[PDB]
């Protein structure tokens with residue numbers, strides 16, 4: 001994911017592509033903050049293509065909608081031509097880069113939060129590599145920056161700290177007394193104690209910190225390019241709401257027509273899915289039935305900004321309907337401020353004794369773009385959903401959907417996973433928002449779409465702990 005440059009202007013991108021690139025050379029960069037630009041070189045000229053994400057997907061002008069920037073790039077490199085990634089040498093979005101950090105503060109972080117192999121890189125004009133080895137000691141290796149090249153005092157001269165770090169991660173430096181300076185894992189600094197969320201929120205709200213953390217998490221999406229073959233099959237193309245927003249094969253829900261654009265999310269489990277198409281309503285009820293799901297969370301309106309987001313897959317109040325071999329009665333509709341509750345009874349046609357109540361919680365006030373200004377409403381909604389799920393003996397995974405099932409769906413599931421830790425373990429527990437996001441993202445592409453949603457998750461968690 002070296003083709004992503006986090007701090008460059010359009011003019012900087014043009015000079016990079018014109019003097020250091022060739023025709024087919026490309027880079028992606030953040031632009032209107034919240035938007036992205038794909039800068040491509042074609043016939044000695046640089047073209048700037050806008051990528052927009054309001055929280056649902058990455059919408060590329062002239063192209064398609066995607067779950068990640070790494071998925072967008074992979075698709076266009078495997079299918080204006082993107083031939084050559086122009087690699088960024090800036091270490092800002094690397095998990096191990098700490099910029100300004102003292103040798104005492106870095107030794108303090110590594111002593112408290114570190115283990116064998118924990119390393120970091122910090123900053124006159126030179127850098128320091130601080131590593132922990134044992135079960136124990138902390139070693140500091142100087143990194144000279146000579147003529148825009150990096151070295152440890154001998155041997156190879158690297159063009160970037162990333163190239164130096166990856167080389168010594170594969171071929172570790174051995175101290176001339178036996179110690180192998182193993183660079184196993186970057187030091188974990190994102191994990192906070194639940195009780196100190198307000199201190200972290202304040203630190204991340206400073207010049208912004210939330211953007212710096214979200215973008216470091218985004219640089220790890222390249223490790224999540226898992227196969228999505230079943231969703232690419234001819235027979236399954238029109239079962240997808242967005243052609244390239246597909247479920248991973250290793251986590252996809254298999255129906256025992258075995259396909260649905262849904263994935264199991266394991267932290268209480270979830271099924272993260274897209275908004276129904278008219279041709280997928282029957283597949284959706286077969287999923288709910290097979291998975292013994294008793295609660296559905298819908299986080300979109302049927303129609304948003306004049307576009308359909310999910311077809312009406314449930315009957316009108318008091319009506320009874322058949323969806324293939326599935327049968328749904330809408331027993332009762334209850335309305336609250338932020339949402340609607342629908343009591344549905346699901347059964348298999350011809351088999352009365354298969355009946356179960358399915359509670360549909362439909363959140364109706366999420367803004368068309370961005371996030372709600374206060375997380376109170378979402379939290380009250382998640383609280384009520386949790387209690388319904390917990391009250392039902394041996395209930396299957398909670399079904400969660402929006403339009404593509406990655407943005408709002410990913411936000412709701414992540415808040416819910418985090419809140420759950422605080423329910424069982426209490427205000428005296430460890431919470432790690434990006435580790436948790438990365439974990440859910442390995443189960444469905446691009447779960448949690450924007451920095452606004454990312455900030456919303458911290459704020460939601462902050463509010464839950466405060467109202468305790």
Ligand SMILES: CN(C)Cc1ccc(-c2cc3onc(-c4ccccc4Cl)c3c(=O)n2C)cc1
Pocket residue numbers: 094095096097098099100186187188189190212213214216217218220432434435438
């Ligand atoms: C403020 N600067 C100067 C210091 C600083 C602070 C925090 C980080 C940091 C940010 C991260 O954003 N996602 C992950 C992540 C990715 C994959 C898996 C798990 C995780 Cl936690 C992540 C991470 O690991 N680290 C360490 C890096 C540098």
